[PDB]
Amino acid sequence: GGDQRFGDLVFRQLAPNVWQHTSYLDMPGFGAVASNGLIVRDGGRVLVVDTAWTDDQTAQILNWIKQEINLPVALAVVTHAHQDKMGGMDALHAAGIATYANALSNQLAPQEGLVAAQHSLTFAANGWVEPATAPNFGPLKVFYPGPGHTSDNITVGIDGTDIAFGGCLIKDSKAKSLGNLGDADTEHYAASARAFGAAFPKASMIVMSHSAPDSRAAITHTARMADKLR
Ligand SMILES: O=C(O)c1cccc(=S)n1O
Ligand SMILES: [Zn+2]
Ligand SMILES: [Zn+2]
């Protein structure tokens, strides 16, 4: 009903200062796969969570931001070294945008056929980002839940909203599978899922890479499906 099309992307306002960006890529056995990230206005700047699949699509995200918000993009954080999350890093860099990822994502990105972020996040033992490594993140609350979908997957809550972003760790409350497990940590996936849920106990809107936003039943149901792996 409320989704705004812009070229080949889709933008959905989730909250006063928060939009979901969605881009698509054909893959065998799936069709044209939606990948979601976030756009957050924080005062006079914009923050991005995840690229689109490609440079061109990512440049279109920046064009939408220019048209609809018309404020500088201060930074992007990208939530692991796969194409749906880091495929457009060159577009961000060309645009002069500072980029952040888990240290491990930056380490894996070259061999994944991806471009590393410019800055590395590190995490306390409890999984909260070390705040000095995430300067100017404003309302973004970055959390490493443990290895799951990938060894390097991270998650993002938004202060002052009921939104938490699971990226490709979380699936929707009616999801059939855990999707791509080629890089999954089969032993630990199950626990990582429930850690995300625990880190963001108040969030009623669970946003994720490959489904529309859902209730926390997404977390309960993802944890459940994961339990069957270990
Ligand atoms: O693991 C999934 O849920 C998944 C399914 C289809 C495509 C991609 S990129 N992912 O991560
Ligand atoms: Zn992935
Ligand atoms: Zn994915």
Author numbering: 41 to 270
Paper text:
The bacterial metallo-β-lactamases (MBLs) catalyze the inactivation of β-lactam antibiotics. One variant of significance is NDM-4, first identified in 2012 (17). Although it differs from NDM-1 by a single amino acid substitution, namely M154L, it demonstrates increased enzymatic activity against the carbapenems and several cephalosporins.
Crystals of the NDM-4/Compound 1 complex were obtained from poly(ethylene glycol) 3350 solutions at pH 6.0 and contained one molecule per asymmetric unit. The bond distances between Zn2 and the sulfur and oxygen atoms of Compound 1 are 2.5 Å and 2.0 Å, respectively. The coordination geometry around Zn1 remains tetrahedral with the side chains of His 120, His 122, and His 189, and the bridging solvent serving as ligands. Within experimental error, the distance between Zn1 and Zn2 when Compound 1 binds remains the same as observed in the apoenzyme model (∼3.6 Å). Our results demonstrate that Compound 1, an inhibitor directed against NDM-4, demonstrates a unique binding mode, whereby it forms a bidentate interaction with Zn2 in an octahedral coordination sphere.
